[PDB]
């Protein structure tokens with residue numbers, strides 16, 4: 001349309017005039033604030049055989065101060081774009097403005113609570129509020145487009161623009177979407193627009209007029225988000241109508257799933273992400289992802305591939321600090337989960353199967369393709385008698401854990417066949433699915449059929465290599481057209497049959513843990529068991545330079561096959577040295593297949609390695625691994641300093657400099673006031689972290705009770721004092737976002753002045769999932785209050801959140817990082833705080849009454865270089881009845897954890913190298929808020945590490961860590 005780099009037809013997208021099956025993974029740059037680590041994520045995604053990454057941009061972090069867009073330092077997107085280009089990964093940009101994503105406000109900055117218009121509509125005030133951000137982010141993305149030499153190939157306007165409720169009846173608003181599209185185009189965006197409908201409803205599909213996107217897309221999370229029963233696969237959850245709906249809604253464009261389940265989020269009081277990983281495990285992937293291929297999906301993006309962390313209060317109340325998501329790449333960036341290895345098998349299959357893109361998806365059947373109704377097969381038939389076809393098979397009841405025997409009856413260029421032709425039966429184990437192929441082209445050689453699945457294939461000079469695999473206890477068969485015989489060139493010939501049937505050479509075999517290589521003419525067929533295949537990698541090999549380049553026919557053709565361990569990042573040829581960059585977490589046997597003709601030596605991670613070659617031309621070597629010593633400090637033994645971070649509870653506290661909560665009106669269009677003046681924090685520019693309110697009044701002696709309704713979001717809590725006297729606390733629960741309470745008060749003297757201090761923990765702002773719900777506008781603060789014997793107006797209020805509010809103090813760490821606690825307002829959470837005159841008390845001693853104390857200490861690290869080592873701060877929780885207390889974890893000024901002992905479920909908090917300094921000094925700080933009469937203290941709090949990984953990853957550069965500085969106007 002506006003450019004020729006990215007085009008499409010009914011079958012697929014074309015990049016540079018070449019068909020490309022887009023297999024993408026979702027990654028959020030703001031959830032990993034360490035620029036030097038972006039390359040690690042991209043290389044791990046590229047190693048799966050993927051060629052694209054989808055990302056959101058969080059507006060709340062870029063325009064915290066209305067009118068000032070800021071995306072520099074850790075918020076700079078350039079290093080993210082650079083890493084993508086370096087790794088050879090294209091990008092789908094999804095800037096919102098609304099992104100949902102389980103982040104605070106669903107992306108909306110807190111000041112949107114003051115906008116007089118319904119969010120995500122054509123209301124004038126809302127549209128105008130988005131103009132500054134939209135112009136800036138679109139301009140940034142425009143420069144990184146493929147048309148300008150960058151990685152960005154697609155652009156998503158809005159997010160799940162799929163429904164409305166609660167009084168808003170303008171959906172679907174054609175001019176609303178057209179407005180977002182026009183503005184992006186006006187800012188320079190020329191790549192195609194792709195949508196992500198919540199369900200297959202055809203919203204904004206081509207031909208729908210104003211607002212229509214270029215390529216219609218939709219999302220799907222068939223197993224839901226409740227990970228409590230990981231082995232339970234509900235009846236009917238597997239979708240079977242995606243192809244039918246696609247042909248009715250957008251037949252002119254490639255079938256696209258812009259967001260397909262790759263894990264699940266987890267709420268406060270949830271079950272933990274380990275269970276989400278177990279629900280969306282490797283079995284889920286092979287069954288559901290192959291099911292997507294049965295529909296002929298041409299663009300598939302998995303949400304999330306890497307989740308990261310909701311550091312610095314960036315998340316919503318519907319979730320906690322961690323955003324591990326149970327995805328293939330863990331929060332600490334590791335790839336030990338079996339689902340990662342399984343996904344690699346499918347990604348690599350797609351990367352070498354262009355015939356799949358031009359096959360025609362058909363109707364599923366329980367009788368046409370096998371001899372048993374217990375199995376369902378969906379065909380993707382070739383255009384003509386000689387074109388390749390694909391058959392996706394699964395149990396008819398997708399949740400079945402049964403093992404079923406069968407015979408395949410499919411059409412081929414040689415007629416309708418009944419496989420296995422040489423005898424025996426095929427097997428489909430519990431919760432497994434396979435893609436059987438017919439007339440599969442391997443560089444000119446026709447594989448009439450193969451029951452075992454294809455991992456990859458390559459042509460090296462005149463030699464052709466095909467890698468097949470089967471699951472445990474399976475019997476398979478394949479046939480090569482025009483071949484005359486075969487020879488077993490590796491392994492025993494036991495269990496392998498070879499015979500000519502018609503004009504094809506048929507080979508039968510049984511899966512084994514021992515690899516077998518069968519030579520059929522110029523074709524070498526590797527016969528593997530699934531678990532051995534897990535250790536194979538297919539790195540591209542650059543002609544010149546070290547970067548692999550984007551994925552296309554040429555770069556795919558010159559790739560090599562490497563059997564190794566934990567990870568293979570890349571490979572390149574320099575002179576006669578073949579360089580391979582890899583990671584190891586154990587002693588690892590190495591095998592290189594297809595080394596370039598000019599390659600004479602093998603260099604692994606810069607080290608010359610002793611290599612030997614076998615009969616099949618395979619290079620072999622070994623990499624030894626020895627767990628290094630990792631010296632970590634004992635947190636309990638460090639020297640701690642602490643200070644009372646609730647000076648407001650003293651009669652000497654002066655709040656004159658605090659903001660006066662004197663607005664006799666609210667700017668919140670979704671909530672009318674119930675108090676004399678607004679006590680909604682956002683009306684005064686305070687949208688993040690602890691919020692404090694102080695109500696001044698002169699007693700008349702008739703007071704008895706103080707009723708109050710506070711609101712801080714799901715799992716929040718509050719504590720109250722009247723002058724120096726403790727009144728009470730609401731410790732919170734996983735199902736409460738607000739609380740009503742009538743507190744009795746101690747006797748007061750008529751004529752004297754008192755101040756009621758209310759401390760409220762803000763858990764973030766809500767998303768606005770359904771247009772018209774205005775949920776994002778749910779306020780934070782005091783909703784109602786009543787002091788018996790007194791008029792409400794008798795109380796004059798002061799309030800404070802983070803120092804400066806929207807005019808936040810930490811431009812480096814962002815608008816959400818710090819809250820309103822005294823120590824935070826002073827900047828004591830940063831490196832080198834002024835602890836000279838502080839008390840020498842540690843969090844292991846804690847408090848003996850309700851209150852809040854701030855702790856500080858430091859420790860040095862000097863971890864072994866050459867290793868990628870994940871570090872975690874772990875809190876103990878072994879008691880039956882949990883004490884009620886809240887903790888905020890600060891590392892070198894960055895808040896990396898909110899711990900609520902009585903709500904959970906997170907006890908282990910990972911912090912990446914870059915935030916933590918592995919070869920320098922580190923400043924640790926904690927706020928400890930006791931919400932029970934007996935006070936609170938930590939019994940177990942440690943810094944621990946997981947398996948050290950011998951890596952080729954470059955040394956991580958520490959991010960900017962601004963030190964403490966006395967702040968003007970602080971209080």
Ligand SMILES: *[C@@H]1O[C@H](CO)[C@@H](O[C@@H]2O[C@H](CO)[C@@H](O[C@@H]3O[C@H](CO[C@H]4O[C@H](CO[C@H]5O[C@H](CO)[C@@H](O)[C@H](O)[C@@H]5O[C@H]5O[C@H](CO)[C@@H](O)[C@H](O)[C@@H]5O)[C@@H](O)[C@H](O[C@H]5O[C@H](CO)[C@@H](O)[C@H](O)[C@@H]5O[C@H]5O[C@H](CO)[C@@H](O)[C@H](O)[C@@H]5O)[C@@H]4O)[C@@H](O)[C@H](O[C@@H]4O[C@H](CO)[C@@H](O)[C@H](O)[C@@H]4O)[C@@H]3O)[C@H](O)[C@H]2NC(C)=O)[C@H](O)[C@H]1NC(C)=O
Pocket residue numbers: 278281283335336337338341403429430432471472473513529531532534535565566567585586947
């Ligand atoms: C360094 O990094 C690496 C990554 O690069 C890390 O390695 C990963 O570690 C994961 C553990 O955290 C592991 O995942 C768990 O796997 C458990 C084992 O089950 C799987 O493997 C069985 C085969 O075992 C062989 O392979 C595995 C590795 O895949 C290895 O650990 C074993 O020692 C063994 O290796 C030997 O053989 C291979 C070749 O085969 C060689 O390469 C090796 O050198 C060794 O010689 C496999 O049978 C099993 O599959 C069956 O079961 C699953 C369900 O669990 C079915 O889906 C599947 O269909 C199949 O079932 C059929 O067949 C069986 C057998 O006939 C039959 O009985 C059934 O009826 C059915 O017909 C798996 O692939 C697994 O138990 C575990 O699951 C957990 O527990 C429960 C299950 O009880 C589960 O529900 C929970 O969700 C939970 O996850 C995990 O899945 C990864 O596989 C592994 N990846 C790699 C690449 O190795 C390594 O940890 C790290 N090291 C350090 C120090 O950090």
Ligand SMILES: *[C@@H]1O[C@H](CO)[C@@H](O[C@@H]2O[C@H](CO)[C@@H](O[C@@H]3O[C@H](CO[C@H]4O[C@H](CO[C@H]5O[C@H](CO)[C@@H](O)[C@H](O)[C@@H]5O)[C@@H](O)[C@H](O[C@H]5O[C@H](CO)[C@@H](O)[C@H](O)[C@@H]5O)[C@@H]4O)[C@@H](O)[C@H](O[C@H]4O[C@H](CO)[C@@H](O)[C@H](O)[C@@H]4O)[C@@H]3O)[C@H](O)[C@H]2NC(C)=O)[C@H](O)[C@H]1NC(C)=O
Pocket residue numbers: 268269270733734735736877879880881882899900901902903904905906907
């Ligand atoms: C450290 O380990 C400890 C364990 O040792 C662990 O503590 C457990 O944490 C879990 C998860 O947070 C707790 O389980 C949840 O508890 C929720 C809170 O339950 C209480 O509060 C409810 C709300 O009360 C207020 O609001 C309601 C209306 O909103 C109002 O009526 C009330 O008056 C009040 O204002 C309340 O409804 C609930 O009442 C039930 O239970 C009591 C006690 O038996 C009973 O008398 C009542 O009749 C009623 O049955 C209770 O008072 C709870 O809401 C939540 O349940 C929801 O979610 C689950 C899904 O997880 C759903 O299955 C369920 O249907 C609900 O939707 C859930 O049960 C658990 O209580 C803790 N265990 C202990 C011993 O304290 C820590 O989290 C760990 N910490 C870390 C860091 O990991």
Ligand SMILES: *[C@@H]1O[C@H](CO)[C@@H](O[C@@H]2O[C@H](CO)[C@@H](O[C@@H]3O[C@H](CO[C@H]4O[C@H](CO)[C@@H](O)[C@H](O[C@H]5O[C@H](CO)[C@@H](O)[C@H](O)[C@@H]5O)[C@@H]4O)[C@@H](O)[C@H](O)[C@@H]3O)[C@H](O)[C@H]2NC(C)=O)[C@H](O)[C@H]1NC(C)=O
Pocket residue numbers: 670671672673709736738739740
């Ligand atoms: C703490 O106590 C408060 C009440 O003091 C609880 O909130 C009430 O909860 C009940 C039960 O869910 C709700 O009852 C529903 O009311 C519907 C009608 O709502 C309108 O009329 C209400 C009465 O005047 C009014 O309060 C309410 O205002 C809300 O919506 C407005 C527009 O959306 C908004 O401008 C206001 O700011 C406010 O948010 C509506 O105008 C009725 O149709 C339902 O059948 C049902 O009866 C009350 O509406 C709730 N009241 C409020 C103010 O929200 C709260 O749940 C308690 N907290 C806990 C944890 O228990």
Ligand SMILES: *[C@@H]1O[C@H](CO)[C@@H](O[C@@H]2O[C@H](CO)[C@@H](O[C@@H]3O[C@H](CO)[C@@H](O)[C@H](O)[C@@H]3O)[C@H](O)[C@H]2NC(C)=O)[C@H](O)[C@H]1NC(C)=O
Pocket residue numbers: 272273274275277324330331332333334336870910946947
């Ligand atoms: C890779 O990263 C993941 C995510 O951070 C790490 O997973 C966490 O691993 C720990 C330890 O195995 C899990 O805790 C354990 O849970 C079991 C089950 O309750 C319990 O029996 C053990 O005593 C222990 O508590 C934790 O649940 C898990 N968390 C998540 C989100 O999955 C993993 O450790 C990392 N692996 C490596 C090698 O770095």
Ligand SMILES: *[C@@H]1O[C@H](CO)[C@@H](O[C@@H]2O[C@H](CO)[C@@H](O)[C@H](O)[C@H]2NC(C)=O)[C@H](O)[C@H]1NC(C)=O
Pocket residue numbers: 650651652653723752753754755
């Ligand atoms: C409750 O606290 C308030 C302060 O918030 C007290 O009032 C201040 O008292 C100090 C002396 O301690 C004076 O210097 C200030 O001028 C007072 N300011 C106000 C608002 O009057 C108040 O006296 C305390 N009440 C009681 C009974 O102790």
Ligand SMILES: *[C@@H]1O[C@H](CO)[C@@H](O)[C@H](O)[C@H]1NC(C)=O
Pocket residue numbers: 368411415416
């Ligand atoms: C081959 O099998 C198909 C079923 O897929 C059937 O429709 C056809 O009649 C059979 N014979 C032909 C035409 O090859």
Ligand SMILES: *[C@@H]1O[C@H](CO)[C@@H](O)[C@H](O)[C@H]1NC(C)=O
Pocket residue numbers: 114115116665666667
């Ligand atoms: C908030 O309300 C006040 C009073 O009506 C008004 O002056 C101000 O412009 C409003 N702010 C916004 C952003 O609408």
Ligand SMILES: OC[C@H]1O[C@@H](O)[C@H](O)[C@@H](O)[C@H]1O
Pocket residue numbers: 099100101102159160198219259264265303
């Ligand atoms: O994690 C669930 C995801 O579901 C998608 O539909 C949504 O667009 C994402 O923003 C996220 O909420």
Ligand code: NA
Pocket residue numbers: 877904905906907
């Ligand atoms: Na827990």
